[PDB]
From Swiss-Prot:
Gene name in the database record: rep
Tree of life domain: Viruses
Subcellular localization: Host endoplasmic reticulum membrane
Biological role stated in the UniProt entry: Responsible for the cleavages located at the N-terminus of the replicase polyprotein. Participates together with nsp4 in the assembly of virally-induced cytoplasmic double-membrane vesicles necessary for viral replication. Antagonizes innate immune induction of type I interferon by blocking the phosphorylation, dimerization and subsequent nuclear translocation of host IRF3. Also prevents host NF-kappa-B signaling. In addition, PL-PRO possesses a deubiquitinating/deISGylating activity and processes both 'Lys-48'- and 'Lys-63'-linked polyubiquitin chains from cellular substrates.
Range covered out of full length: 1025 to 1191 of 7096
Its membrane topology: Multi-pass membrane protein
Protein name, entry field: Papain-like protease nsp3
Source organism of the structure: Severe acute respiratory syndrome coronavirus 2 (2019-nCoV)
Length: 167
């Protein structure tokens, strides 16, 4: 039993809800919140910009030190950093950005990072400003993640469409 509330159950382990991931994380304070990151951890817009603003830019400060030490992530890769005031840990995961020409096949690799954590609050990777089809992002998530994932979908039109089209 965990403290996630109001989710629709899609499969044995994947749940989905219409919610702002920032407000969800502040309420639940999960062990792991997933960020929709880029390889430079420049948290400018989308989910990443929203999560960072909620930390008063502390996420960006920590991220810049991480990059200065380790260099950029790989597309499809991830790193674990602090969850600041939002969660115990933030898993920064790089889904492909279709608007940069990145291979959509790397989306499965991105979701595989979730399997290293027993429970996560997460967005749909590569959705939104990353330019991939959110219906596709959901299918890959369901077919790749085996740990317990609670998906926060920002757009009502998307959320209702995601639910009504789910196979
Ligand atoms: O697939 C990620 C989706 C796609 C997006 C562009 C249209 C809606 C942003 N995003 C979010 N998902 C959950 N919580 C969020 N909080 C702030 C942004 C955000």
């Amino acid at each position: 039993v965990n403290s996630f509330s109001g989710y629709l159950k899609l499969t044995d382990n994947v749940y989905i809800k219409n919610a702002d991931i920032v407000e969800e994380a502040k309420k639940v304070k999960p062990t792991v919140v997933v960020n929709a990151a880029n390889v430079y951890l420049k948290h400018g817009g989308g989910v990443a910009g929203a999560l960072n603003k909620a930390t008063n830019n502390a996420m960006q400060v920590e991220s810049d030190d991480y990059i200065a030490t380790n260099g950029p992530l790989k597309v499809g890769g991830s790193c674990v950093l602090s969850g600041h005031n939002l969660a115990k840990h933030c898993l920064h995961v790089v889904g492909p950005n279709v608007n940069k020409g990145e291979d959509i096949q790397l989306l499965k690799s991105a979701y595989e990072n979730f399997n290293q954590h027993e429970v996560l609050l997460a967005p749909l990777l590569s959705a939104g400003i990353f330019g991939a089809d959110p219906i596709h992002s959901l299918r890959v998530c369901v077919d790749t993640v085996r740990t317990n994932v609670y998906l926060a979908v920002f757009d009502k039109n998307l959320y209702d469409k995601l639910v009504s089209s789910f196979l």
